[PDB]
Amino acid sequence: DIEFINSLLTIVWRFISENYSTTQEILEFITAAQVANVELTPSNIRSLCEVLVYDDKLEKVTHDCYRVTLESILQMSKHDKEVVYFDEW
Amino acid sequence: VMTISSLEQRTLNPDLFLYKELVKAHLGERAASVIGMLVALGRLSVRELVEKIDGMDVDSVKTTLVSLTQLRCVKYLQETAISGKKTTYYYYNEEGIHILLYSGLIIDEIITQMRVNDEEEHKQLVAEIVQNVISLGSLTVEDYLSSVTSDSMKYTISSLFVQLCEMGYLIQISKLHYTPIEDLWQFLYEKHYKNIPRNSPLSDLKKRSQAKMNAKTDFAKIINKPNELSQILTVDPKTSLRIVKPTVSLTINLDRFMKGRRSKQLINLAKTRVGSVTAQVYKIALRLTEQKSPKIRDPLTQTGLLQDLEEAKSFQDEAELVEEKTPGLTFNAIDLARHLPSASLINSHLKILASSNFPFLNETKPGVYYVPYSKLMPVLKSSVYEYVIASTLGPSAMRLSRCIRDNKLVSEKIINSTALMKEKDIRSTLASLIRYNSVEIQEVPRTADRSASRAVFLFRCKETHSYNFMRQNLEWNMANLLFKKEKLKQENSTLLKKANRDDLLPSELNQLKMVNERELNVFARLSRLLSLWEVFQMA
């Protein structure tokens, strides 16, 4: 219920920096058993994989594993200007 | 209230007003009239200008005509009819105003890529030459050489002239080079259907093969005519060094200017995905191979005719095979750390550029490695686009954009599960995402043909509609930008005229610094989003 969706905002924070990490599903098999909180099942295999899958978490490379590139950089008007949006046209 | 919010101008001028805005700053009055009308009504005739506006007949038209021709702001075509006489129709020409929207940006790359000559007299020299080129719109060599002072070094400015031909950049003036792509195809299309002396009524589909194949080889010789020809430029009579033809004139070109910035976009993606050294290693490759790389020149047959449903690929992959051919065949064999301004072989730094590919950079052939110009563009459009939404809205808008792009067309059931966290905030940013286009809406019913609500929903596609929304970003940003910059002129016009005559008082110097401030910042904003639009114009 409410207990759900709030448990994924914690354990995924800093583990990224310590990750080439071989065998994509082992990455969960690693993450699944850890912190002694003992996460439950392969339901989490496809969870942190395909949820955070986009934009700078970890890069997707073949033979089932994760790479890292540009997240290291992110972890590190007078009269008229911009407004950049809406206005239609 | 008071309308000062600029809602008045907001609705009614998509594309359009862009053109006649620029040329207004260029010239104004009559010049903006003709072009603006040449856009709105499209194809136009000389007599037709007089009818519409009552434009100060035949004094202005003949004056504007030659004025538009020198800078080639009008695409020119002439033909006749079966009845008789003659007709001359004008089109809005290519993007030639966009070049006027470029100017110094082109001259920038001209100065910066003129290196391999180290900080020389060149800076003041060709800057005077190039500014004389674009402004006049056409430059003959001898009349240009005549403008140079006497009793001095004549080949000092010709030290870089034959160096202006270079590889890309300035090419010769040739004939029909300005011409509608649709029309030249139709003009070349003659002598093809015209070709058969009552041969034989067998296999009607062979008329296809005949006309097409003969048109393609006749099309290639025409488009590669301006591309690379060493006849005029490489002329080398005795009692001198290599000297460009004193007769044939020159013109600037799309080739390496549109390429140089395209490489920048690749560098921006590169530099993001690798170190500074790796971006340099990949750069030195591009600098040598940019000559034979079509890239920006890609479609070239697209405008002016049909593609197909069936034969679309037989057209497309016919281009893809010649996009396979020239990059595969011609391009460089493996070199070693060529020159440059890490010892031994740097190919190891290429191998780390190899093993890591997705999205781009270094997919290879046995014995030779090069980056494809076909499959590269999709991941280039992806990145930049996702960074646009990233800059625009918060991190939530990012994550959901791909969530629709992993699989396709699904309901909120597996979306709520697989996306991140909370229903209500998702619904909030769902409406924010679905606000302007780009996800569309899916239409499928529930236990009825067409009835009512509770029908199932899905989210998908709209690649081109999520492209064009960045083409709205083209004009309307630059519009108010340039406009209220021009309004800044006429407002302070009484001051500017006083400043020009002076070239006094405490408060007169104040508004002098004011406008100049606003001016410098508004041009920096122009080139800013200019670089953004340029990448979005393709695919």
Swiss-Prot record, chain A:
Role summary: DNA-dependent RNA polymerase catalyzes the transcription of DNA into RNA using the four ribonucleoside triphosphates as substrates. Specific peripheric component of RNA polymerase III which synthesizes small RNAs, such as 5S rRNA and tRNAs. Involved in recruitment of Pol III to the preinitiation complex. Involved in the configuration of an initiation-competent form of RNA polymerase.
Organism (species): Saccharomyces cerevisiae (strain ATCC 204508 / S288c)
Taxonomic path: Eukaryota, Fungi, Dikarya, Ascomycota, Saccharomycotina
GO annotation, cellular component aspect: cytoplasm; mitochondrion; nucleoplasm; nucleus; RNA polymerase III complex
GO biological process terms held by the UniProt record: termination of RNA polymerase III transcription; transcription by RNA polymerase III; transcription initiation at RNA polymerase III promoter; tRNA transcription by RNA polymerase III
Covalent S-S links between cysteines: none
KW Electron transport (keyword) present: no
Complete-protein stretch covered: 171 to 315 of 317
Main subcellular localisation: nucleus
UniProt-recorded name of the protein: DNA-directed RNA polymerase III subunit RPC6
Curated annotation (Swiss-Prot), chain B:
Subcellular location, record wording: Cytoplasm; Nucleus
PANTHER family named in the record: DNA-DIRECTED RNA POLYMERASE III SUBUNIT RPC3 (PTHR12949:SF0), RNA POLYMERASE III DNA DIRECTED -RELATED (PTHR12949)
GO BP annotations listed: termination of RNA polymerase III transcription; transcription by RNA polymerase III; transcription initiation at RNA polymerase III promoter; tRNA transcription by RNA polymerase III
Protein species of origin: Saccharomyces cerevisiae (strain ATCC 204508 / S288c)
Region (Leucine-zipper): 474-495
Transmembrane segments: none
Tagged with keyword Plastid: no
Entry's family note: Belongs to the eukaryotic RPC3/POLR3C RNA polymerase subunit family.
Coiled-coil spans in chain: none
One protein family per Pfam: HTH_9
Function: DNA-dependent RNA polymerase catalyzes the transcription of DNA into RNA using the four ribonucleoside triphosphates as substrates. Specific core component of RNA polymerase III which synthesizes small RNAs, such as 5S rRNA and tRNAs.
Primary location recorded for the protein, binned into one broad class: cytoplasm
Subunit structure: Component of the RNA polymerase III (Pol III) complex consisting of 17 subunits.
Note in the entry: Present with 2520 molecules/cell in log phase SD medium.
Keyword annotations of the record: Cytoplasm, DNA-directed RNA polymerase, Nucleus, Phosphoprotein, Transcription, Zinc
A single Gene Ontology CC term: RNA polymerase III complex
Name of the protein in its database record: DNA-directed RNA polymerase III subunit RPC3
Annotated GO MF terms: single-stranded DNA binding
The UniProt record lists the keyword Transmembrane helix: no
